[PDB]
Design a protein around this ligand. Structure first.
Ligand SMILES: C[C@@H](CN1CCC2(CC1)C(=O)NCN2c1cccc(F)c1)NC(=O)c1ccc(Br)cc1
Length: 584
């Protein structure tokens, strides 16, 4: 179909039936498939990134320069492939887009990088994209950047010429984002945290590859941004940055046949035009969902008040739950969030003001004030709200220094699954910054199944979609620990037995982690003053590692309940002249 008019959900691109699409959970498979695709490139590679680490290794463990992103692009450029890269130009964050740019363009003249914007603004280019020959396109939450590679093992430690290398995360790739922010990125092979005393923060994310027509659509977005960016400053207007043009006619890993629609958030400042089709697709999927929602997102800032927060995603969730309760439907909403925002902050002091600002708007959405999801649900249905929504996070544990250590798994995914039939995957967080269009630029794909699998839904036979069911089962299996308990029935995602098991695990795990590590966040610290005395106590993990180790044997999976009462007696907003909407 055409691009002369707008389409479903007011998107620039129509839905593409018969699209091969494959989802990825965690960075390990995404970066491997990116590496394989780069190797087979014949003409063009398009890349957009919020952050691009040139020296990141795409396959692990590294034994040579092969599979290192910069080396792979240099090799393809030497065969005549044109690499075009759109990088976010941060306000000197410490991501050093200048080093990424200078390093990539030093490699070969066939690699061209533009940065945007030049003008001062609060907003960023957030989309993550890699397109090969305008026929294969990767998108999702994963930047080609440090800290993103991980796998189901979610290793907390990495203790062991690279021919005999055993580290999975070399140098700057080994990090704990909450402990300390990245420094000295022009020294990629230098550690910046103590590998022997400070555990990794595991990184969880979701990506996707699409083939055919939706890859053309994503390439067309890149081309518009590329040619628009050309007009943004004199240096880029010169012929050394060629105009790009989309392929039009006659449009490989292992994907699933689905209907895929590309979606994006863009504005005048970020592109030629206004669009917020990710938001529209989010709302419509919630409105039309019939059985359950699974939401895994880095942020959860919503519930409009007309002033500070504007998007209506939370309101749609509330309306669906209120309707399910009114009609007597079995309906479940699963919300998976990172236990703490991804900023550098000593949580034992209370967290930085960035952490506190996000928590304010997160808790305003979840359970605090007249607009919160739980307050409107509680008002209508009392304690029955627990039958309809579950808010959880992830945590794991390991061993370091001869005693157990624990850290949350950072949920960076931006995925929604509905009814085991529909999936949204992209870069768009659930907040005003990602969804309004006017602010950050974002990408997403709407994936609707056309092929089905026999499954269950509240005890009844149910034809689930192949792409959506496999993703949801893979998420559920890793999160709840299905490897260790092969008796788990993950066919039915909404029946009482399974929903109870989900909540029971969340409560059981959260209690053990709190008993062993006294980890934050926690329901046991309702104010900063009780927080100050609470952290002055040495946890059992270090008091008696053997006793700690024994009790940790009862943890199943990584699922922990998201503590809704952490610091609930504090205002949490910082005082001051900064607009509050920087964080929303
Ligand atoms: C989890 C992350 C943080 N999130 C990034 C993505 C974030 C929100 C914050 C988003 O979700 N949208 C826009 N945005 C953002 C961020 C910073 C400036 C800006 F202008 C926009 N930490 C790291 O990966 C990270 C990497 C390098 C450095 Br140094 C610092 C952090």
């Amino acid at each position: 179909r055409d691009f002369l008019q707008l389409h479903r959900h007011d998107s620039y691109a129509p839905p593409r039936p018969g699209t091969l699409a494959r989802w990825f959970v965690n960075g390990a498979g995404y970066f491997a498939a990116v590496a394989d695709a780069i190797l087979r490139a014949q003409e063009e590679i398009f890349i957009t990134d919020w952050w691009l680490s040139p020296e990141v290794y795409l396959k692990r463990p590294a034994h040579s320069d092969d599979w290192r992103l910069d080396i792979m692009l240099k090799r393809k450029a030497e065969e005549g492939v044109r690499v075009s890269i759109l990088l976010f130009k941060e306000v000197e964050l410490g991501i050093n887009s200048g080093y990424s740019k200078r390093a990539l363009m030093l490699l070969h003249p066939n690699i061209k990088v533009m940065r945007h914007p030049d003008q001062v603004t609060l907003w960023a280019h957030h989309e993550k994209l890699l397109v090969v020959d305008q026929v294969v396109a990767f998108l999702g939450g994963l930047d080609l950047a440090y800290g993103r590679w991980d796998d189901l093992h979610y290793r907390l430690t990495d203790l062991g010429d690279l021919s005999h290398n055993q580290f999975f995360w070399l140098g700057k790739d080994y990090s704990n984002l909450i402990t300390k922010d990245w420094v000295q990125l022009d020294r990629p092979f230098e550690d910046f945290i103590d590998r022997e005393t400070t555990p990794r923060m595991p990184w969880r994310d979701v990506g996707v590859v699409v083939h055919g027509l939706p890859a053309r659509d994503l390439a067309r977005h890149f081309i518009q941004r590329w040619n628009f960016t050309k007009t943004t400053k004199a240096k880029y207007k010169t012929p050394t940055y060629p105009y790009l043009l989309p392929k039009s006619t006659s449009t490989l890993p292992g994907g699933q046949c689905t209907t895929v629609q590309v979606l994006r958030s863009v504005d005048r400042w970020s592109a030629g035009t206004l669009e917020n089709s990710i938001l529209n697709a989010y709302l419509h999927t919630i409105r039309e969902s019939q059985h359950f929602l699974y939401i895994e997102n880095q942020f959860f800032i919503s519930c409009s008040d007309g002033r500070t927060v504007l998007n209506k995603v939370g309101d749609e969730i509330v309306d669906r739950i209120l309707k399910a309760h009114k009609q007597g439907w079995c309906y479940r909403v699963y919300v998976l969030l990172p236990l703490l925002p991804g900023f550098e902050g000593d949580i034992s002091t209370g967290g930085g003001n960035s952490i506190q600002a996000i928590l304010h708007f997160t808790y305003r959405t979840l359970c605090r004030g007249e607009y919160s999801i739980l307050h409107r649900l509680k008002a209508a249905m009392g304690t029955a709200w627990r039958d309809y929504i579950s808010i959880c996070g992830l945590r794991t544990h390991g061993e370091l220094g001869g005693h157990p250590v624990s850290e949350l798994i950072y949920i960076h995914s931006k995925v929604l699954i509905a009814d085991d039939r529909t999936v949204i995957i992209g870069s768009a967080n659930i907040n005003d910054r990602s969804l309004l269009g006017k602010r950050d630029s974002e990408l997403a794909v709407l994936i609707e199944d056309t092929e089905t699998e026999p499954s269950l839904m509240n005890g009844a036979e149910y034809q689930a979609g192949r792409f959506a069911l496999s993703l949801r089962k893979h998420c559920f299996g890793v999160i709840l620990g299905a490897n260790t308990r092969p008796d788990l029935d993950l066919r039915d995602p909404i029946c009482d037995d399974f929903f109870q098991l989900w909540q029971d695990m969340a409560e059981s795990n959260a209690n053990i982690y709190e008993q062993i590590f006294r980890c934050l966040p926690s329901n046991a610290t309702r104010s900063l003053r009780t927080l100050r005395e609470y952290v002055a106590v040495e946890p059992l993990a270090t008091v008696s590692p053997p006793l700690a180790r024994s009790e940790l044997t009862q943890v199943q999976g990584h699922l922990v309940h998201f503590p809704l009462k952490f610091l609930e007696d504090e205002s949490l907003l910082p005082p001051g002249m900064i607009p509050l909407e920087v964080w929303t």
